[PDB]
Design a protein around this ligand. Sequence first.
Ligand SMILES: Cc1ccccc1C(=O)Nc1ccc(C(=O)N2CCC[C@H](O)c3cc(Cl)ccc32)c(C)c1
Lengths: 225, 379, 212
Amino acid sequence: EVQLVESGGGLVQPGGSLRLSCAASGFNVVDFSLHWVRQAPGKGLEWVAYISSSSGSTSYADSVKGRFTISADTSKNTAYLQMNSLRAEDTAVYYCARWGYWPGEPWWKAFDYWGQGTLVTVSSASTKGPSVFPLAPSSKSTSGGTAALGCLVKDYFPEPVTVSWNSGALTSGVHTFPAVLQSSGLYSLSSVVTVPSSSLGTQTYICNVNHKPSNTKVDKKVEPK
Amino acid sequence: LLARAELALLSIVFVAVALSNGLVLAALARRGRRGHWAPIHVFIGHLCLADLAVALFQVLPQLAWKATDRFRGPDALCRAVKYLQMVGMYASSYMILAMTLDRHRAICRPMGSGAHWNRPVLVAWAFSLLLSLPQLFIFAQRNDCWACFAEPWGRRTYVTWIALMVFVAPTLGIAACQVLIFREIHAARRQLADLEDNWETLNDNLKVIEKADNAAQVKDALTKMRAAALDAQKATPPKLEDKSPDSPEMKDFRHGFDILVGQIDDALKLANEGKVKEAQAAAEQLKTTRNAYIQKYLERARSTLAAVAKTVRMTLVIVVVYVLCWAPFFLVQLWAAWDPEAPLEGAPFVLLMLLASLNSCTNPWIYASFSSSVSSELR
Amino acid sequence: DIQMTQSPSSLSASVGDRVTITCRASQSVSSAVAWYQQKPGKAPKLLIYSASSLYSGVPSRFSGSRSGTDFTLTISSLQPEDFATYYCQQYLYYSLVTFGQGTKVEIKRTVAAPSVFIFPPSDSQLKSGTASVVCLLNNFYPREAKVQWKVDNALQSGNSQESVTEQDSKDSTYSLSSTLTLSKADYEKHKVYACEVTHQGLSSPVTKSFNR
Ligand SMILES: Cc1ccccc1C(=O)Nc1ccc(C(=O)N2CCC[C@H](O)c3cc(Cl)ccc32)c(C)c1
């Protein structure tokens, strides 16, 4: 019944402009104040801005004061946030929360209905396909147990990337670590798999990496050492 | 002729008690005829009655040809007199317990009754009458008129039981009720202290807003005021007053604070926009509204707690005087009864008797000094 | 500005264990504190909408309490779904909203002594003009798995990037991987490489070596 949906997020460059929008269904924006709260990747929540269409009052955080502009439209029942002079630190997931007016309980229920949040990334880099580098196992993993194998993917700007083993057949002890941004502005991660050490050639494993933003699909095969 | 002292003393003390009690009762009747009858008055009056009974049954008979002697009458009169004395003792002990229980009820669990009686006092009188029945069996016209009891320790079970039921248990119950009552009163005191502190911080921050000259200080003071107002609005009245949901509070207290916080929010909006002068004007309007709304409620709340504390202090004084006056008597009687070393006796029981009667003649003065209306009536 | 600080950075707990999270405010906010629960890849969820008042749709499992300026969220019985981050918000006014640092609740387990593996750079990286020696520590529950690189038996810091995968629910363990990026010229000038792990699970620090 009550729902908030955000849109307009995407990838931009420092100093650019963006226009986030939040549409509310199930209630009236006039009867509730709409707040924009951003969360940096891996960090805590941070209130950003707020608007109240009943009186036209708006407020912003000090860290973003003078750059963002928050407005509302009652006819369409949607709040908007125009972001200008962006920077690297502005990358985050922006949620829109609803907060009732003072008299009574609607005020004590703080941010009782959020939205799914929209991702915004600020970076001067551009789309680039991911390279692949196999990580050949030890010369002879004779130690009692299982050996390790994997691959490295590097130099891709848009975060999403899919890694599969044997076309999804291999799923025992698969670990794909979170992507970490490098000093060059491009992401990079590694995928690893623990496999029986009894035989490697008889059960050859391959890694397939697909990247929708650049439409880059590549498959590689590892070899013993 | 040591009786020169003894009888004489009895006489004067008798007079005292009688007079005082009479006077107090008269005052009550006047205050019951002029239209200012009170729920506590009944208790006090009945307590006075008990005192009178004590006198009429204990120091007047003892103010005879040394009571225990010939020339009294048949065994029936002696048994009746002793029963009257014991019921008087029980009533004196238990009326204070009834008063303390009433105070506990009025301070902890606020809730028919006539104009000269009620449930607790009637219960106390009935218990006093029914628990003193044994005095008829033990006492008779044995012959002076003394009582002979069971040779196998008739004393360690009668005198000890009397002390346990008259002094030990009622006094322990009164002490427990008093400590609970004082816990409750101390609770209703820190809450009013919190409300007073919220009022003080609100006033101080309003003065700061008036004196301020920049948006930052005005906004900080407004935030402090808003937090203080929110804290104050969540201050339910103590159990010593009316029920929390009612026209006085739901309609004027909570609504008053809601309008208060609305004005604070409007001032904060003006300050955030950057118009400090509008914020100061809104703060002045806030002063006007708060003075109009909450000052009278706070003043009234500061007064009822005072009356409750005064009546509780009166009850505590009554209890303390009663214990100080009656403890030696029961202590000596129990010492004589339970102990095998009883024989030693210098006839100090007369002093204990007079000390016990001191409480009966002192209670009315205690009540008079703790009630302005009654003191004015005694004029 | 009103600042809210949560003492517990991350609490480890097992199913059925009562847990508590504490927060402190710079000023006195009149019970205007809310408690939210966020799970990975999801928006927060209002658990407690005042100092103590529970929100609709939330089990009585959670509770809140206030003491002057201290605020505490207590969970009596911890369930598998309970594991998630928790945030404390102070909402005294529209323009004075301020969240806490965040407390992460995760499953408990015994130490596991992770197995350390080392992957030397592939020859393709050398052909392309780069080197990336990787170290892998998998299947250890407790965190604080300090890893130190050594190039030619010399500590190297400031160029190693480490990523730790989320604690999987099938085994309740972690898997950390650290890559020491190096230039080709900076790579060939050195002969040996090694990694050292000082994790609690291991009785003594472990070291893996690689010869070029
Ligand atoms: C005359 C007077 C004036 C002011 C205050 C007190 C008195 C006074 O004497 N009361 C009194 C004394 C003795 C008696 C009395 O027979 N037993 C019988 C058992 C023996 C023992 O003796 C006793 C101890 C206790 Cl604890 C209670 C009652 C009594 C009675 C029934 C009343």
